[PDB]
Symmetry: C2
Subunit: 182 residues, 2 copies
């Protein structure tokens, strides 16, 4: 039962005309788009889309605490807390603004090892350090320090399901059974 | 208040991987995509999307009849009737079968004089005489003789609204207010 993954083009990405450039890369690799739609998500939808586990909030929190040390930013002065879970809730809230600020395009990609292949093509979380050839490296120059100073998340173009399991959940979230056509 | 039009990539064109190539031509011209979805359409849906006016059936019918005549096909031996409206109903059934044969991708394109622009970019009905530069001349080599010989419609990649009037209708038909995003 061939593997599927969910990909979202975030609002900067759509507004900049990158839909077709990004679709072209998956196509050329041999992935089929088996669902596709442009949507305005409400904050509610984005809130339930992203996890709410403590583990996730916590692990997103440390990434940014680690960041704040390197730039010498006191997180207490910057966002009012140094608590990892609380900082996670602030990141999630930032995520919600950004994914809510314009239309998204959501697609399901299907092919041998879709989930890992899409992560590989998309590239790492920071575009400034994503290698050339990757979607994030070829189409963005944003960086986690700029994001930290401007009080936002990184504008890294897309979200890709980080696992088979997470993929089945995020797919079901966006698409009813008969919108996914194989 | 700026003009919009409805474009459908038909199953052949979705299957051949032309979604991104086609989206690229519109983005380059300055049109914005304001609605986009991949859909598996039912027979009844396509039945209702295409007109059922005698006027429309009649004219669809004459074009095929002219086609048969230049080919020296007897429409009575070929399809059982030579009545323009009855022929239009046969074409409509063939239209339905083809648009129903796999996923379509429906989009709404907004920009100055969108309907003509998109009609201009797409090219005339037969890809075989569509000039190079147009969507139908660059991506298809189909022709009405072959289609006739083979008891089917022309595989001409797309459907474009043929007037603003018809566009406001084809737009409502496929999208709720909330999906056509302003």
């Amino acid at each position: 039962p061939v593997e599927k993954t969910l990909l979202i083009l975030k609002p900067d990405a759509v507004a900049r005309g990158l839909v077709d450039e990004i679709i072209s890369r998956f196509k050329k690799a041999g992935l089929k788009i088996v669902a596709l739609k442009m949507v305005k998500a409400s904050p509610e939808e984005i809130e339930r889309f992203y996890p709410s586990s403590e583990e996730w909030l916590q692990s997103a929190g440390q990434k940014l605490l680690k960041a704040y040390q390197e730039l010498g930013i006191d997180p207490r002065a910057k966002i009012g807390t140094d608590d990892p879970v609380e900082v996670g809730r602030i990141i999630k809230r930032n995520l919600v603004k950004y994914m809510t600020s314009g239309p998204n395009v959501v697609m399901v990609l299907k092919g041998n090892r879709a989930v890992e292949i899409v992560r590989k093509l998309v590239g790492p979380t920071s575009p400034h350090s994503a290698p050339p050839g990757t979607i994030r490296g070829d189409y963005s120059i944003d960086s986690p320090d700029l994001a930290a100073e401007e009080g936002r998340v990184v504008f890294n173009l897309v979200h890709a399901s980080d696992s088979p399991s997470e993929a089945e959940r995020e797919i079901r979230f966006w698409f009813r059974e008969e919108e996914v056509l194989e």
